[model samples]
Target: MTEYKLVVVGAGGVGKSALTIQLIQNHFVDEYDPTIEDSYRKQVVIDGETCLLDILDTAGQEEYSAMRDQYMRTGEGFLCVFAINNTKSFEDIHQYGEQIKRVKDSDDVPMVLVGNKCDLAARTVESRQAQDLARSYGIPYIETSAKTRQGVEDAFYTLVREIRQH
Candidate 1:
């Protein structure tokens, strides 16, 4: 009977849409359409409670910077994502986290640190590094692969759980 507004934010080419699509559509999308600010919804039961998840799949391109704050303010929780194979994208997660804090004006938000592209054999960001970063933020960390659908549901479901506890 509850609903959670979840936002997926990350640097371009990091599979933000892929992860969201995998969760909502049950399939992997191979390409990136950096212009899409697509919203998706799914009704599922988590921990014995049925809830609705309104997921905002935000645009990652720099040109879409204008659309960020409005969604950031309205989001109840976030999946701050990065690509495990891209070091630059990994570094960008901090700025996204900071911007969320600035918009929501609170450090105690329901957020998760997500490392996507875990299906790739090559990784620039180590698992422990992401784990350590999440530890620093005092949030949960989940690794996901939208291609293989690894840990995809947990990434979103955990954020909903975080919102419940918040």
Candidate 2:
């Protein structure tokens, strides 16, 4: 089976872990505590495909910078997540890309810009603005809701398909 290392990254409280958990297990954390420590690694199979996805869910706070760099260096692809209701999260995409570039030493590594928490559309901060930013970065973008499981699978699957095709 083909193995791919994927990292999910974003600012703290933006739901990076939630997205990863939903994509892997189709479950959501209901308690929603932000103070909880973050950083998890899990393996998941892409259904109907001979591929194993090794997912590294990293903490978003600045304290995890070193660890984040370590993972980015070896990651084959990335899911750069942002909360749909947080403009700051969307704005941090460039910073995330910069970190990845520093570690991976390549600007062309495949990445998907994920706008999570679609379940709260009414609270969305800047949907079009986020999309425009992602487009400007020339990466694929998708809005996902881990709570409702909307586009959760597609975000990861699409990235895998694109990476494989290229």
lDDT by candidate, in order shown: 0.91, 0.78
Q: For candidate 1, lDDT tens digit of each residue in 78-158? A: 999999999999898888999999998898889999999998989999999999999988899999999999999999999
TM-score of each: 0.97, 0.87
Residue pairs clashing, model 2: none
Candidate of highest TM-score: 1
Which residue runs does candidate 1 get wrong by more than 4 Å?
none
The deviation in Å at residue 119 for candidate 1 is 0.8
Each prediction's RMSD over C-alphas, in Å, is 0.9, 2.5
Task: Name the TM-score of candidate 1.
Answer: 0.97
Model 2: which ten-residue window has the lowest total lDDT? 33-42
Candidate number achieving the greatest lDDT relative to the actual structure: 1
After the best TM-score superposition of candidate 2, give how far the Cα of residue 92 lies from its true spot, in angstroms: 1.2
Error of 2 at 52 (Å): 0.6
Clashes of 2: 0
